[PDB]
Structure 1
Amino acid sequence: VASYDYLVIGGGSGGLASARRAAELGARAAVVESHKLGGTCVNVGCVPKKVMWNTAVHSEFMHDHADYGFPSCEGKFNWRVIKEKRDAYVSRLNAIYQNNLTKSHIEIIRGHAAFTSDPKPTIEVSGKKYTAPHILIATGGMPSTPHESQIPGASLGITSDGFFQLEELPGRSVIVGAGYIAVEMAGILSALGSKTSLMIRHDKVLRSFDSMISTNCTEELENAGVEVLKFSQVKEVKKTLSGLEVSMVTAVPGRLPVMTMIPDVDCLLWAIGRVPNTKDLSLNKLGIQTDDKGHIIVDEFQNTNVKGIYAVGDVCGKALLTPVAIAAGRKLAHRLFEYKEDSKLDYNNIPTVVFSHPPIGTVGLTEDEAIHKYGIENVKTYSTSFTPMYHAVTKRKTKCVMKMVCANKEEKVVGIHMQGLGCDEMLQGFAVAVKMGATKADFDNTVAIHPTSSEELVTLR
């Protein structure tokens, strides 16, 4: 039994960040990783997605070429060219992260970890045992797929993991789900020329976002050629002579249900959610508490119910983002190795960007959330809608919408929501201001930058 100061299960965003910080603090740490370092974000998440987004963005801008005085750009996108370059980039990152661990003197244990029956919390990886007075579980999650039992032929569709393995652009694609990944994939496939449908259970996407965003986002998708099938769900999928055939039920409220077959489908993509990866950890050998979806339960300091066992990131199932896992992993290292007992992550005011077309940025409370928190009488919003100057000369248009949610008489800024060109890079600094407790006066007293989209947020009336 080899002992360490800190054992980290999972070499993804949270696991890498926590191990690295702990090592800086003097801890003798090891990272257990069964697949590729960098975890979901590097291999099949943030990175490859952003590359594909940049690619789709190229497609769109190329539609405006002629408006801008250039000669028309003619054609066919070549999927394998970009696919090969994307894969190489990911390989580069895998090598970098491995180096990052080595330079920090962090041991890398390759293989799948599971807890043992042993009294003191101990793990086994390939027949060898390892132990530490502090063990971090950061095994992340995976894409959720339906059971053949409830949707026959569901196994014929792929997930976002499968998306990153595609070698050719699918002719016809159907995406099921209404959350960020669904929206992002539909947007990439459509821009690159796939005849895309997005199938959602209700009438809008991103229904958990502020209502101005879910509405606007649903519209922009339609404007960009994505067919949004509302109140629809898959009833069954089958392999026909040439592609898949999707049976769906459309149940608009106030209407009779109607069944429709979708033929000649090349790609059926499930983007219905993520499941935590805890199934094969042998948690129950230590009685570690999970919820009914398999998420590990933790307190505000990332503690599990078992002393010296912590969990961070996607496995805990809250705020499923790379930077959250990183921040929580880091705070935890300071608490354990720097004896900063108050060291923990504040889960309020975490900013998010959705790489749609145009991108979405949000931080803080939606209007409804502020209303429930402070009361209708105490919430005031400010909003704007405009056409970015970029489209002053194009036949193709997109809009920019922004909304500011204020609370109390002071008009404290409690939420910012926007969609529009530039929004992906614009959010960060306002997120700083919101975190600091800025009020509308603070925004208003900041001199604008002209001409930009960002200035609109500081001149709301």
Structure 2
Amino acid sequence: TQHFDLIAIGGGSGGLAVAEKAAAFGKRVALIESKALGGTCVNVGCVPKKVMWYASHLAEAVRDAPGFGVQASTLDWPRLVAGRDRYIGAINSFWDGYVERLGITRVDGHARFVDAHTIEVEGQRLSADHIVIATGGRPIVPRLPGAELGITSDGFFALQQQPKRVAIIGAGYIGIELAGLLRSFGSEVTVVALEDRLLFQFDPLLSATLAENMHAQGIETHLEFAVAALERDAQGTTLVAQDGTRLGFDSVIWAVGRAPNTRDLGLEAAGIEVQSNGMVPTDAYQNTNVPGVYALGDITGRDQLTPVAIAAGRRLAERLFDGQSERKLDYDNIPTVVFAHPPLSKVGLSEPEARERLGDVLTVYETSFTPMRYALNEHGPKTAMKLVCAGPEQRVVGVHVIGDGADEMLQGFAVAVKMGATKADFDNTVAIHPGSAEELVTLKEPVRRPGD
């Protein structure tokens, strides 16, 4: 009730990770969770999406099979969801049991700080030497007229039936992944975005290639399209832009970012520093401004990814409970995959970023090609790759790929980039043939040198 070494607020990626490691160092751990263990990722994030992603991968596969002489003949969405939910349910079940197995005290409900070192959960108060905030986020629904006519990614994973005509508002990760899933399943898919290109945070080569692939797949896009309101039309719902432009959808999905769950956490009661956008500032070691209070995962405003939350959690527990006083996560060169169809992946800096952060010091290599996966198909999606290099030695500061296999391609490259790999390091590595990844180690002439 006061004798806990650790209270982890939130049983998602970060909370589970720090609770787990702490418990393994023989600490007394309390874990607070208002909903289901596993958090966003297991329930409404990474896992349901990747399961649905395989279904779309397999659907593309049955379309392309006759081209290779494989005689194949459409989605049963209820069966997909049922299978997906059984699988997700099993991971929830694992975690429920694992937490009990570790000896962690689970507390159901919504935790709020009551002071610098105590929380209250449905009237019950609990103190600890260390309180870790890992409450994650939730999808943003804009304060616009008729915004409630649209659903979010949470709503997407709740859908019991496949919608026929979809509008996706936002072209970040989830907007693009949702678009690719649904079009692959044969829905009409339009995506709209504020920006002049899809996947704005990513390198212009990936953005451009993705657009081509998406256009080729029949996905309608509208760039520089600000949604002013959503309205009800004759059997369906309509998007209304700034200028008055109208768009008959049976589903409109808001994919315009996520907000941190820090609104009534009692942070002011505890004197915890928090930004106007709800992000909780931390140092490199997840320390907030209040000693004994830490934040990790999405609410910290750094790379919004599951393995980032986990790693941040494990290292924090190592720091606090294993006397590894200098232990921290490195937030440079975190690899990521966007599960489009075909998917994309990157580690490190895009060209514009590297040009921002470093000078006119960039040597940039790139290539485009149709992979052998589509050799016997009519119009396969193009693969595109860019190596961003910096300095005379050509340190590789960015690796960017879009195309078949990209989802499994960059993990090892992330290792090399973290080790400070140069172009030479890549080039002295013998290719694997035949495949796509070999293209990253056989780039010859650069497209841009310092001066461009």
Are the counterparts in 2 of residues 67 and 394 from structure 1 also a CA contact under 8 Å?
yes
Q: 2:247 aligns with which of 237, 262, 286?
A: 262
Q: 1:145 aligns with which of 135, 141, 145?
A: 141
Using structure 2 for the length normalisation, give the TM-score: 0.96
Amino acid corresponding to residue 9 of structure 2 in structure 1: I
- Is residue 366 from structure 1 mapped to residue 350 from structure 2 by the alignment? yes
Q: 1:288 aligns with which of 259, 272, 293?
A: 272
Amino acid corresponding to residue 135 of structure 1 in structure 2: I
Match of 2:435 in 1: 452
Q: 1:423 aligns with which of 380, 383, 406?
A: 406
Q: 1:369 to 1:241 in 2, by over 3 A?
A: closer
Amino acid corresponding to residue 303 of structure 2 in structure 1: A
- Is residue 383 from structure 1 mapped to residue 366 from structure 2 by the alignment? yes
- Is residue 217 from structure 1 mapped to residue 230 from structure 2 by the alignment? no
- Is residue 301 from structure 1 mapped to residue 297 from structure 2 by the alignment? no
Quote the Cα distance in structure 2 between the aligned partners of 1:4 and 1:451.
56
Amino acid corresponding to residue 69 of structure 2 in structure 1: G
Q: What's the CA shift for 1:72?
A: 4.5
Match of 1:186 in 2: 179
Q: Deviations over 1:51-92 (max 9, x none)?
A: 11111111111111211113341xx31110101111111111
Amino acid corresponding to residue 270 of structure 2 in structure 1: L
Match of 1:205 in 2: 198
Aligned length: 444
- Is residue 16 from structure 1 mapped to residue 6 from structure 2 by the alignment? no
Match of 2:310 in 1: 326
- Is residue 165 from structure 1 mapped to residue 158 from structure 2 by the alignment? yes
Q: Deviations over 1:2-54 (max 9, x none)?
A: 42011100000011011111111121111111100000000000000001111
Match of 2:94 in 1: 96
Q: What's the CA shift for 1:298?
A: 0.8
Are the counterparts in 2 of residues 64 and 396 from structure 1 also a CA contact under 8 Å?
no
- Is residue 111 from structure 1 mapped to residue 109 from structure 2 by the alignment? yes
Amino acid corresponding to residue 457 of structure 1 in structure 2: L
Match of 1:131 in 2: 127
Quote the Cα distance in structure 1 between the aligned partners of 2:20 and 2:440.
37
Match of 2:41 in 1: 41
**In structure 1, the residue corresponding to 2:367 is in which secondary structure?**
strand
Q: What's the CA shift for 1:241?
A: 4.2
Q: Deviations over 1:84-111 (max 9, x none)?
A: 1111111111110112212211111111
Q: What's the CA shift for 1:369?
A: 2.2
Quote the Cα distance in structure 1 between the aligned partners of 2:357 and 2:159.
45
Quote the Cα distance in structure 1 between the aligned partners of 2:147 and 2:202.
28
Amino acid corresponding to residue 66 of structure 1 in structure 2: P
For structure 1, which runs of at least 5 residues remain unmatched after alignment? 250-256
**In structure 1, the residue corresponding to 2:409 is in which secondary structure?**
helix
Amino acid corresponding to residue 403 of structure 2 in structure 1: G
Q: Deviations over 1:348-404 (max 9, x none)?
A: 10001000111111001111222233321x210111111101111101311111111
Using structure 1 for the length normalisation, give the TM-score: 0.94
Q: What's the CA shift for 1:179?
A: 0.6
Amino acid corresponding to residue 168 of structure 2 in structure 1: I
Q: Deviations over 1:243-284 (max 9, x none)?
A: 2122234xxxxxxx4x33222x10000000000001121111
**In structure 2, the residue corresponding to 1:344 is in which secondary structure?**
coil
CA RMSD, 1 decimal: 1.2
Quote the Cα distance in structure 1 between the aligned partners of 2:77 and 2:241.
29
Q: Which moved more, 1:366-375 or 1:12-21?
A: 366-375
Quote the Cα distance in structure 2 between the aligned partners of 1:453 and 1:325.
31
Amino acid corresponding to residue 54 of structure 2 in structure 1: N
